[PDB]
Amino acid sequence: GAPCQVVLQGAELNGILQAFAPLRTSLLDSLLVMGDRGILIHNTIFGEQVFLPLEHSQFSRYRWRGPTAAFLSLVDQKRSLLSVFRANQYPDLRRVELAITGQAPFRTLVQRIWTTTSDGEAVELASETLMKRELTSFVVLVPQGTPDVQLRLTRPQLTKVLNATGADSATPTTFELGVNGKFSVFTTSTCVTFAAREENAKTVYGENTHRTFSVVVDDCSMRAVLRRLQVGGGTLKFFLTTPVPSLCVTATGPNAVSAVFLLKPQ
């Protein structure tokens, strides 16, 4: 049997399908990084770092052995390993398997697909099978550490923030958290404000609300990226104790997708 085996059927397959539903085509060209803890999907959208961690526990069965494997999601520069998780690409989808075989750095992933047929017969779509050898060498740089501040925004609150975000490099935007727990985002022509609090439309729940800060971002990318990914409300995660500060926005809907934006040094 294959050393590494991944299965999605039933409830777990439904969970994954729901997670991918808002993401549309956004992740179809991506790096898949596979290890014991799950599949980390990585891409860049409008120059910004985008991640989707699919935890091992979210799969019906998950077994991994040997080193981390990385795969480009595209096979023969056409079909994607993640095309199976598009909302309506396989209407009768019933089961998906990943088998990874061979030895590093030359292992092959095989993806197999089943559809429930009349009377609930699980028939394999053999012609839709996908095969991919791992990247023989890869480097990916990944977020680490605990954020200094976390602020959870509902879908209306985040869309207000994206509207307050600057339209171009010539009109940058500032994110600030003040001594009184006032959180605010502003630029040359507009401003938005919220009352942050530790875990009523202006109330924002969070962690380390007492840690005041001011940070700036030049790019309009944060609005474009988070709309592209269809983020329906999310946690703003601020990383401040680094040479370049960073903001990670993690979605709170069906998708667990995250975009990371570099912040102007203080």
Binding site: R37, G38, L72, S137, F138, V139, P147
Partner: protein, 1072 residues
């Protein structure tokens, strides 16, 4: 008195158009050294040689070139009392001319010859040589062309009651002709007679009464046939007097030995007086056909001469590197090399160099020629183009080389010379052949053709392209390939510079001109083209000139005409075999039908004369037994069998094949020179036999019968299917094969037995023999072939075992690569090493092919691909054993990016057709390189020359330098056009090659061949080949630096497995 018929070549000349390069005025100031002088000059044309000077047109003792001339300008320069007795003479050519009794009244011809040309008659002139090497012309009198017309049709139309009346009608139709160019003709110029003949077309055709009409002139014949009674079909009006002379005199030939003999009333050939000579010959005779006999036993060629010549020209316009145009007065012939050989001994006898301007051959050249034992070059110098060209044509007329050769002389040298002579100078050419005037001397484009009366032009370019397969047919490439004689070339780009420099450098031009003619002479005496052409001329009953230049049809036509006349006829004037592409590691036996189409014609008695489109034609005959019924193109056709009526085509083929067998039997016992002649003969017979099928199929050809042609192919197709079904039925099991061929017992290989046809073309079948070994199989194959032949087909149809492949890639119809049992590789219908590619792609492509065929691991794995449809291989691991094939691609990929790599392997090249501003598609790699050369460091430029280039990676500096100077008259994602680079620059700066460009062209090349392994599906092939290459991923350098300063951790890379694992655990914790 002077000549009876005026000599039209120049024997005197005292003014001419003087054209010479001004640079020859090496005393003149630099302001007047460019361009040509072009004006008339009032003096006799002159030639200089070795410090002496002579009039070009003077004949006498001290000439600078050899002569084989008796008359010059109507003066007899023969020795005192010159009167050689002629008995035997060789004929190499035959002319056809009209003479008129009135014109010849002052010549002293015997009455019998005058009567034959009263008032006009066709004279057949045989040209050749006596054993003593005297040039002879023998004028044969009394041959008349003739055609036939149906008596009933003519009588019913013209109300004719007697042959007298018909002659009046024809004479009247010529008197009344447009342009009046026959007024003077009368019914006396014709003879009509009633004969019984049969139209050659169809079995049911009854013998009928025809008028056979004799005419005295080909001109007259051609008009009547194309204008007289157009509703009435003419027969054999196309047949020339030479053909009638040959066919109506049994045994006569167009090339061979003859004897003068007494004729009927004890008549003898009459020697002409010199002033009545029609040609540049030593002796001339008048005779009739009864004064001639073929001389048996004599076969050696007499001492004919060969001239091998080559011209050099100099473009004289604003660009000295432009191709010279004969109509441009300033574009000059500047030299002519002329080597004269004895064609019987092959000895080189004279080396002449005609030079416009003074010319001193290099001492090294002279020493080399002396060491080789060759004649010392004679250098003929001239002040002008006209003087030189006139001297050359003077040599041609006076020396009269019966055979002329060179390289591309038909398509270049002759047309260029004759354009100069005809258009610039106003020289008539019609006296420069053998005839002293009014002879044919003409070039015409189709490539191109030449006809010069009495002169057999054989262009070695034609001979070599028709005989040897080469990457280039440039003379130097040919000399390397054929003579193993590697040598240097002087570029046309060099000529203007050498020419201007002086007599020593013009001498270097001369050396290279001489060397070129010497090489051509070697090619000529290697291939001996005159011997094969003369063989065909003799067989076909046509002259050697028509043999060279007319098509295949006339050869079969003339032979058919001979037989048809003998037989009383007159000739009227006008899918299961498809291959599944794939790779076979089981042996493939090739069965080949021997001369299939000829054999079908003979076996099935096909002919014009056996065919019927009507059932009532053969209702008196027994079906099957007496005729073949066959559906062809939707029609029912009948062909009666040989015992009902024998096919004329059958007879021709049978007799030729019997003759060819007799000749090939005599060779093992023949002397070394006999072996050469017998070999040429048997080869001539083969080419004529193989043309019979084609002859019947030419719509609008001489004597078409598309019904015969179609029947041949239809029977062909059915025989191949019959061969397949017989093989399949008779040898489905090994036990059946062993019962026929018991030696097959030891031939049994381990796996399942099968014997199936996998391919078949027009005349061969490929039989895949699963479960048999390749070793005994070629021998058992020939006994299979014999057995099949016996069981299925009529003699002389023969199936033969041709070869056995051990490995075979069937690509498509007529495309395959196979290894023969002896280990040799055979490639058909594909090129592996295309000229558009760099050496890297060509070498790697060939290496992949060699691996498929010579690594059994790869071979067996490649065969295993056939077990599954092509799409399935996308979804599963490929057969184990293809690993090495993948390794070649990975190595090739790695070799592109290697900093230690030879740039020269990756160099492409493109010429500059014209200045870069004159292009429309200005995005071309070589134009990008042209402007980069200019832009950076004003690197050495180019014009009408080959620019080498390499395709380079987009290293940002290329983007910055993309602003080319062409604007003085893309900014991102650059085109291949823009990423082109000078290889010297690329070497000097360690620039990276474009991996995508080179590797995609390698995968392209691979998909031409290996696509057959995957259903001929190029996209799957490309995908599966691309999959072998290692993929890597990294963030860009700037991004990576930024993310590291943002505190991002590294995953994969050179980190340990544990570091990577832990880092991903951190990622999942942060991203959640």
């Amino acid at each position: 008195t002077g000549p009876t018929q005026r000599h039209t070549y120049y024997s005197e000349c005292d003014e001419f158009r003087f054209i010479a390069p001004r640079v020859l005025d090496e005393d003149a100031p630099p302001e007047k050294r460019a361009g040509v002088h072009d004006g008339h000059l009032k003096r006799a044309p002159k030639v200089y040689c070795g410090g002496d000077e002579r009039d070009v047109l003077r004949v006498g003792s001290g000439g600078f070139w050899p002569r084989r001339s008796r008359l010059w300008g109507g003066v007899d320069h023969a020795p005192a009392g010159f009167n050689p007795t002629v008995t035997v003479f060789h004929v190499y050519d035959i002319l056809e001319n009209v003479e008129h009794a009135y014109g010849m009244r002052a010549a002293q011809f015997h009455a019998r010859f005058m009567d034959a040309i009263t008032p006009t008659g066709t004279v057949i002139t045989l040209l050749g040589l006596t054993p003593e090497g005297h040039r002879v012309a023998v004028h044969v009198y009394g041959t008349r062309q003739y055609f036939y017309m149906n008596k009933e049709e003519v009588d019913r139309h013209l109300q004719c009651r007697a042959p007298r009346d018909l002659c009046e009608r024809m004479a009247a139709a010529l008197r009344e002709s447009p342009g009046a160019s026959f007024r003077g003709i009368s019914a006396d110029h014709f003879e009509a007679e009633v004969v019984e003949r049969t139209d050659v077309y169809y079995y049911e055709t009854r013998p009928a009464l025809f008028y056979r009409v004799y005419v005295r002139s080909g001109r007259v014949l051609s008009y009547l046939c194309d204008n007289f009674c157009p509703a009435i079909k003419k027969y054999e009006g196309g047949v020339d007097a030479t053909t009638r002379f040959i066919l109506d005199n049994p045994g006569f030939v167009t090339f061979g030995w003859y004897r003068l003999k007494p004729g009927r009333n004890n008549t003898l050939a009459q020697p002409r007086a010199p002033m009545a000579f029609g040609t540049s010959s030593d002796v001339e005779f008048n005779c009739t056909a009864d004064n001639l006999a073929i001389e048996g036993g004599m076969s050696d060629l007499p001492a004919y001469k060969l001239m091998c010549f080559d011209i050099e020209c100099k473009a004289g316009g604003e660009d000295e590197l432009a191709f010279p145009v004969a109509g441009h007065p300033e574009d000059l012939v500047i030299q002519i090399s002329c080597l004269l050989y004895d064609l019987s001994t092959t000895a080189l006898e004279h080396v002449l160099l005609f030079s416009l301007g003074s010319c001193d051959l290099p001492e090294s050249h002279l020493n080399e020629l002396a060491a080789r034992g060759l004649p010392t070059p004679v250098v003929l110098e001239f002040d002008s183009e006209f003087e030189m060209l006139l001297a050359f044509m003077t040599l041609v007329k006076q020396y009269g080389p019966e055979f002329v050769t060179g390289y591309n002389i038909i398509n270049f040298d002759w047309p260029f010379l004759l354009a100069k002579l005809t258009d610039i100078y106003k020289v008539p050419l019609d006296g420069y052949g053998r005839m002293n005037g009014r002879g044919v001397f003409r070039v015409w484009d189709i490539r191109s053709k030449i006809k010069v009366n009495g002169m057999v032009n054989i262009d070695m370019y034609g001979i070599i392209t028709d005989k040897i397969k080469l990457s280039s047919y440039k003379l130097n490439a040919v000399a390397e390939a054929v003579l193993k004689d590697k040598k240097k070339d002087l570029s046309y780009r060099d000529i203007p510079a050498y020419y201007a420099a002086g007599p020593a450098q013009r001498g270097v031009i001369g050396e290279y001109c001489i060397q070129d003619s010497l090489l051509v002479g070697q090619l000529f005496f290697k291939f001996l083209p005159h011997l094969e052409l003369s063989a065909v001329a003799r067989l076909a009953g046509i002259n050697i000139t028509r043999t060279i230049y007319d098509g295949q049809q006339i050869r079969v036509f003339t032979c058919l005409l001979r037989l048809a006349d003998q037989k009383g006829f007159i000739l009227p004037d006008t899918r299961v075999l498809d291959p599944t592409s794939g790779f076979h590691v089981n042996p493939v036996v090739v069965f080949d039908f021997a001369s299939l189409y000829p054999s079908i014609i003979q076996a099935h008695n096909l002919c014009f004369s056996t065919l019927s489109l009507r059932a009532d034609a053969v209702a008196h005959l027994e079906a099957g037994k007496d005729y073949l019924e066959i559906e062809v193109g939707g029609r029912r056709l009948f062909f009666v069998k040989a015992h009902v009526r024998e096919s004329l085509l059958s007879i021709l083929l049978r007799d030729w094949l019997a003759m060819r067998k007799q000749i090939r039997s005599r060779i093992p016992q023949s002397s070394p020179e006999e072996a050469v002649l017998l070999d040429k003969q048997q080869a001539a017979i083969k080419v004529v036999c193989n043309s019979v099928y084609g002859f019947t199929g030419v719509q609008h050809g001489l004597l078409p019968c598309l019904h015969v042609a179609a029947t041949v192919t239809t029977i062909g197709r059915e025989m191949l299917l019959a061969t397949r079904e017989y093989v399949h039925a008779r040898w489905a099991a090994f036990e059946q094969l062993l019962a026929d061929f018991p030696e097959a017992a030891d031939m049994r290989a381990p796996g399942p037995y099968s014997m199936r046809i996998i391919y078949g073309d027009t005349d061969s079948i490929f039989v895949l023999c699963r479960g048999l070994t390749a070793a005994g199989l070629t021998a058992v194959g020939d006994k299979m072939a014999s057995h099949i032949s016996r069981a299925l087909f009529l003699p002389p149809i023969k199936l033969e075992c041709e070869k056995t492949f051990t490995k075979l890639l069937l690509i498509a119809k007529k495309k395959y690569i196979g290894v023969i049992y002896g280990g040799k590789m055979l490639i058909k219908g594909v090129d592996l090493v295309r000229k558009n590619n760099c050496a890297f792609i060509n070498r790697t492509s060939r290496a992949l092919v060699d691996l498929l065929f010579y690594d059994d691991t790869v071979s067996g794995a490649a065969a295993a691909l056939a077990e599954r449809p092509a799409e399935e291989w996308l979804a599963r691991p490929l057969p184990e054993g293809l690993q090495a094939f993948g390794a070649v691609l990975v190595d090739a990929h790695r070799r592109i990016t290697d900093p230690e790599r030879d740039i020269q392997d990756f160099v492409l090249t493109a010429e500059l057709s014209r200045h870069p501003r004159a292009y429309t598609n200005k995005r071309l790699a070589h134009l990008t390189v042209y402007y980069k050369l200019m832009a950076r460091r004003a690197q050495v430029p180019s014009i009408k020359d080959r620019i080498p280039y390499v395709i380079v990676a987009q290293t940002r500096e290329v983007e910055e330098t993309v602003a080319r100077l062409a604007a003085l008259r893309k900014p991102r994602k650059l085109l291949v056009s823009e990423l082109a680079e000078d290889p010297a620059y690329a070497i000097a700066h360690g620039v990276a090659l474009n991996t995508d460009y080179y590797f995609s062209h390698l995968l392209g090349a691979a998909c031409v061949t290996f696509k057959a392994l995957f259903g001929n599906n190029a996209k799957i092939t490309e995908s599966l080949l691309k999959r072998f290459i290692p993929e890597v991923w990294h963030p860009p350098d700037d991004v990576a630096a930024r993310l590291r300063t943002a505190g991002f951790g590294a995953v994969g890379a050179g980190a340990t497995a544990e570091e990577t694992r832990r880092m991903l655990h951190r990622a999942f914790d942060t991203l959640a």
